[PDB]
Symmetry: T
Subunit: 146 residues, 12 copies
Amino acid sequence: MKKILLLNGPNLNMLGKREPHIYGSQTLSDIEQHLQQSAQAQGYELDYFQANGEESLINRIHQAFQNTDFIIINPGAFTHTSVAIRDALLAVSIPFIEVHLSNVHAREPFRHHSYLSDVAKGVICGLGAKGYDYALDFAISELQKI
Amino acid sequence: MKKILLLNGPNLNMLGKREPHIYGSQTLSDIEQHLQQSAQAQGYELDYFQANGEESLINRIHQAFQNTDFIIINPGAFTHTSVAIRDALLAVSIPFIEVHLSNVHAREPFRHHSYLSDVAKGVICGLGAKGYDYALDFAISELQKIQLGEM
Amino acid sequence: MKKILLLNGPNLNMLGKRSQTLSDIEQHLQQSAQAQGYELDYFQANGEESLINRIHQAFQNTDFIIINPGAFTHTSVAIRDALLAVSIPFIEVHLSNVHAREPFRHHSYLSDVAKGVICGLGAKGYDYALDFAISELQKIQLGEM
Amino acid sequence: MKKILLLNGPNLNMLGKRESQTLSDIEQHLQQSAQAQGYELDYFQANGEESLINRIHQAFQNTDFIIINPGAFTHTSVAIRDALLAVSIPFIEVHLSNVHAREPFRHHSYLSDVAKGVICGLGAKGYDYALDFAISELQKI
Amino acid sequence: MKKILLLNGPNLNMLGKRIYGSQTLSDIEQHLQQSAQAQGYELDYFQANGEESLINRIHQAFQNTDFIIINPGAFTHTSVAIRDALLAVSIPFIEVHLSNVHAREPFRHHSYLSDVAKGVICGLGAKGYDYALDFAISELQKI
Amino acid sequence: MKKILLLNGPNLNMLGKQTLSDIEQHLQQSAQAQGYELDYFQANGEESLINRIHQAFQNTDFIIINPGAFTHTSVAIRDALLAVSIPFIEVHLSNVHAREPFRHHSYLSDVAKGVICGLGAKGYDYALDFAISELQKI
Amino acid sequence: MKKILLLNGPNLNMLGKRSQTLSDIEQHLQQSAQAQGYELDYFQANGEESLINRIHQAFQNTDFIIINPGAFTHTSVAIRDALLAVSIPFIEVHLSNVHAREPFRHHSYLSDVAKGVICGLGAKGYDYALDFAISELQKIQLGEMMN
Amino acid sequence: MKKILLLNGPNLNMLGKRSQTLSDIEQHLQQSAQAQGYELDYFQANGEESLINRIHQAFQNTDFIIINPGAFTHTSVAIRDALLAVSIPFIEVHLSNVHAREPFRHHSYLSDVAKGVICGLGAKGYDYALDFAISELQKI
Amino acid sequence: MKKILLLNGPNLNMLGKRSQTLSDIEQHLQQSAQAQGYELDYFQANGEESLINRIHQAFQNTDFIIINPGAFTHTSVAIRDALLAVSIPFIEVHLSNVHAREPFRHHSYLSDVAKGVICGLGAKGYDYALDFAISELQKIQLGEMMN
Amino acid sequence: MKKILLLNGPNLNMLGKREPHIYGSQTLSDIEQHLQQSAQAQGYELDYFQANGEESLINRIHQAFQNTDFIIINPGAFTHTSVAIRDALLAVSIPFIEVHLSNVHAREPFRHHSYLSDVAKGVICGLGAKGYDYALDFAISELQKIQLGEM
Amino acid sequence: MKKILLLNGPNLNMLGKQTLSDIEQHLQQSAQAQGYELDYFQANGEESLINRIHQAFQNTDFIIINPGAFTHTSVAIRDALLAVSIPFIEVHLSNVHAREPFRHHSYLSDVAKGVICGLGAKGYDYALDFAISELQKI
Amino acid sequence: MKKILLLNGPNLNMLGKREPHIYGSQTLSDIEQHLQQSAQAQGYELDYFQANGEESLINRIHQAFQNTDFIIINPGAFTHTSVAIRDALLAVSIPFIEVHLSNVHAREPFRHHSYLSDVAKGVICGLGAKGYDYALDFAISELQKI
């Protein structure tokens, strides 16, 4: 069974804020469960992980080496600052798609640069949580073509 | 009924025409037909247009004013040069998603800048033709919220 | 005789559509020029080819140009070169204050070669440009006299 | 009886032989024209920020619109920008020459982004247009 | 029969109507076509003031034209679209400019075409087109 | 109730090796003297600092932070502070403007209530006074 | 007896006119310093000449300066040089947070040579600056006794 | 007959107060000029208005200017424009070497329009400027 | 008994996994140093906190540091400050030539305060760094003897 | 009579010497001889010189003062670094055409800047050895205009 | 056999006025200690240095070069090294990154096999070790 | 009796040779002779040298080591490009003054930067040949300080 790994960077654990399930908002837990179940329904295994530091994220990326076939990652702020995470993804040779919930290009100039975009298979920005859904569909289509 | 407009910019008509294919045998027409059929199958209308110049593209955008509810656009090279198209999209106040077949961030540095990305609802880059399918899916989700709001 | 050409760039045709429209401005300016004794032609287009062709057509028959290039102010070296090629003096006009918007709108490929620039005074900016254009043409007429 | 204040910055007092018609000519012309329309127009010129800023502060609560050609200070004076913002009086920036056609340092202004509008390169007529606009704005109020 | 396409961008139609002389764009087009044919080559020419017209002509040359000589005019500094059109049809080209672009404003120092052209000739007036044709033919002789 | 959190970034534990502990204890002492509770924390990594910031969500009323080197590199910490919506003041013992150019930029300054730089340990004293004054207004 | 000079730059005289005024701050600070045994003079002007002359006048008789240069923090190399010429330590104060405003307000010709900078804390910033100045002078005084 | 104007900008009055003062330089230059049959006026101020007004006052009656604008060399477009307005040739002088200081002191709004610039030679810089000014007035 | 600390940053643990491994290098350098009479400790981590904590722990007991910071050379002001805080001279080592890659790898927050930098010489770069560290310590020891 | 001076800068002497060829068996000497023979056959004088340093090149430029009428120069790497050669060419007031075998715009960004291109009559880049032939053709046409004007 | 060429640029002859000669002789000694031949050359101008590089074409296997000031200004020397296709290692006695900003850029670093900077004369020793190492994996 | 070295860089030998005249009939040789005669008349020794390349100039600078007390140099275009000459001057520890005939700040933007001005005792630009006379006067005044 092919495996996909979902990675979320700093502060993404805070999604939903106060009482998320009171007006249609959602937590990271909701998103992780949704993607995991959806991948399983298609016959694929999907693992997920979230952390607020480079060491934790890099260690998880290294752990995926030789057992994971595709990665979906929203690095959060590390998108703009982490050359170390870029190098971790390059070191394990696993294709990945970069996802951002908000439109980074519409925010501060320092968010217009990514240390992952140029080496990612593709990037989806500004479509909210649905962006993860599209990334999962693409990941599976890539795994099917092999 | 709600309507979606698919817009493709300069050189996109060359898809599938290059011999040593980059994406494959698929042509722009294949993508246009596929998206229109998918939209109609879901109860939505979808028009499509492609041109290699700003005037043609801008005139089509203006023509969409007050009759089109969402736009899916792959501006091609104009994403890096066209403030005119940016202003046309803003002038008609129709939300849009920017799509690119290739990963613009993996090419020349000048392709890293866009006059549309910051005002687009979202951007999908590097996922080939599938990118248009995701854009259509998102467009429909937005139109559904609009329809509900009109109730 | 002595003729003036009003040129409006991309998206200006959308004025008052989303109360004064582009047509309202064009007709008003043309009538104002006529009352002052001058013939004013007008044209608007959303592309460089259409605009450049109109500029070329003005060569040798038009004496002054009033132009609001719209977004092309920031991108069109081609229109700059068209205006320079025909040697017709011009004033650049903008309805909104370009300096109060995004940084990329702070640069113009026309401002440095324009006789002058008027920005942020709405439609009245065109009236001032017309007044100046006429003053320049009067000097030309007397000079050839 | 609304009031308009005309302000001219450094070196404008030298108009005439500086790189015809003097500043005095322009000031008289504008004052008389404003008066003919039923408006009062005061004018002032100085070569320093303290003098100009003090005049701007003095206009607070008694002046309805400002027409200003800050001269070289358009490119260097954040202080005058802040004085104009502090008194909350709408203003139009005027330049006799085309600043965009000169040295690169003259391409930037600390007033343009907060001015109601800017007129550059039309000589003294620029002041006439600024006055017409000022009056039109006051007629609205 | 190998074919060469001469492309001229915005404002080139103003040549000889206003720097270089009485010679017009038509003069150059005819002269270059005559010279090409006299050497056993076919040459088409086209001029337009917009990206759409130029890009459409470039697409039309796909698979039937072997070399392009182009003076993009101002579009050399602004048109990524024309750059991509030339790359999409895979036809080698030489960029020509009558005036020396490096001796003018700083913004004319940048180009979206020069780095993908076979070569560039700038500042030699109308003779630049003659040299471009000579090079095109010499290159086609290789094949 | 009236809770203030003092946060110190990487390398501040090396102070005097006054010491960091001297500063932490003095601010706690002064906060207590005015009827406020103050907690303090210091760490050398973003994960540890971000986790402490998240832990303060909805239970801490004001933050006093000297991010150390992270002032110039951590967008992640900026986002953690924005995520918890707790007002804060940025403090630096040394005058960052008098040091290398890369220290002239802060990812926190524009979203902080204010910044105090160059007054040594006294800067923390003033930051605490300000925090209390802000909380009394609310 | 030690002396502190409070300097305020262009437009600060407009405080509370657009409820605390510049005068309120000046009087508050002077009263605070005097109550602690320190003399304090204050001055405000909208021009470089006036401010520079006042700075020169403080040479050899003033022990610390608290200055809110207003807009001149971003443009006045002349005031920077005046403060350096008289060798009097100073603290730069700003009511609003300059880092949260236009990019051009992010640069200062005084910050790098100031003892310290306080920005965005409102009028309280002046109080902290005064406290620091006095705390510094008190250490100097005790040092002189023990020397 | 011919007249030279010596101008000094902000903070120059502090020279020798932190042995030779500004006064010593002003008096020395005036005496040297008068001894050579030339008239020389001098002025110093810490603001643009004062300096610009003195420059305007020299219009059509002063033949050469020697100016040490102090910090205004880096910030005053106004003084640049005042000197251009009166069309009087000038030499820019600086006691210290501006190029050896902070990067912001490497730019000048006067240097490109000055006849020449002398920097880093201390008070002697003013002597050389005076010598040049006189040689210029001699060929006219 | 002088001591040298070998530090390796993010992703260095992947060496030879994509034949010589990081452990091969660590063991080799420790054996070489200790055969020369010098104690050598080694450590590797993928995060700033772990690396910084190890650097602080070296304070007052370590005489020289050999560090390949990995990607952190381009991003970590925090590690720069940790090394400066402990006042231990260090040599920066990189297996690949950082100047032959992307433009962003041309900048470092460590190179300007390092004793020296060795870049692009593969694993042997660590050997040269160790030789230099020992050379320095050997000159210091002889100096102490002759004094 | 009119004279043309052909100047070649640093490393040009390596032409046709690299095992794997870049341009061909053609050497610097071949080009020098070809141009000199061509110029002479048309009735013009042509000197040629090549050196790897500024002093040698500048001295040759000074030597050309008042006796040379046009210069064809391939400055090699010095086009990006030599203000001294720029000033030498300006000091002698001899018009010149800058030539480069390879396309300087298709290489590293630092090669996009030149201290000579802005003051050259024209520039030819990327056409190999033929670039020199075109430069010679133009130079002779310019010299003919001068001779014609000599009445 | 294998030949290595040591090149030193402008002003390096002023060393100690160890000396430049101390370094040249030490590398020659160490090269011969492993059966390799090593030539050395120093000059204060581009023409002299470039001519020596051209002279090494097809007879020299590796170059060790400290371009001195030319590291920051000479595109011509970069192109000479590329023209002769001889791999090289760049060396600097002082730490260029710790000096003026203009010394932070090198026209050789991106095309060199490696760079050693700030280790004084020993940097040359290591550069030689590397050169010999490279000539053996072959 | 303490020696001064006058150094002139690339293209200075062209002085007084271009007919459409810029400075005048005066040549580089005239300035050299004039400055040397003046120095000697004041009880000082003065050597002069001019060359169009860095190697020639740097070698002359090195030769002045330990026998020359002050340098007057007009580096010509090398002021904008030669880090090598800057380092040669620093290596010999000889104080120098930089001189230029024309006003380098009134030309192209690239002429605003120098690799020599910041380490020179002072700079004189735009005063033509007179600048050399002032430089000599200053050099002597500095030597008298010793």
